Design a protein around this nucleic acid. Structure first.
Length: 104
RNA sequence: GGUAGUUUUGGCAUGACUCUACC
């Protein structure tokens, strides 16, 4: 038995990226990662301080995601050697608290 | 109900609350 299966959870894959500049944004990220396959979404982590030093990227499927991972893992950008990984199970994401449109 | 910004406190280590808008 397992916590999930590849029957309904997902279609794309997702990639953690560490040690990136605090001065990168979602378009600065996808510019490097998109040379291996189509980006579908991007995420950056925020205490207050901007980027918590890492971000994530969403790729059209795993067989093009892992190409970026084996290539960009160890690349130094603005002097900082980045890591590239599979993402590992998000928080209870709930940026949908209230709006007039939600029911009436 | 569907999407984006306003801006960092500073290298934090696998995820985001919070603020301002649009719809």
């Amino acid at each position: 038995g397992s916590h999930m299966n590849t029957e309904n959870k997902s279609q794309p894959k997702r990639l953690h990226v560490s040690n990136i500049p605090f001065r990168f944004r979602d378009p600065d990220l996808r510019q490097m990662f998109g040379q291996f396959g189509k980006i579908l979404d991007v995420e950056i982590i925020f205490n207050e301080r901007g980027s918590k030093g890492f971000g994530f990227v969403t790729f059209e499927n795993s067989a093009d995601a892992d190409r970026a991972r084996e290539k960009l893992h160890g690349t130094v950008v603005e002097g900082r050697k980045i890591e590239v990984n599979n993402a590992t199970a998000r928080v209870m994401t709930n940026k949908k608290t209230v709006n007039p449109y939600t029911n009436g």
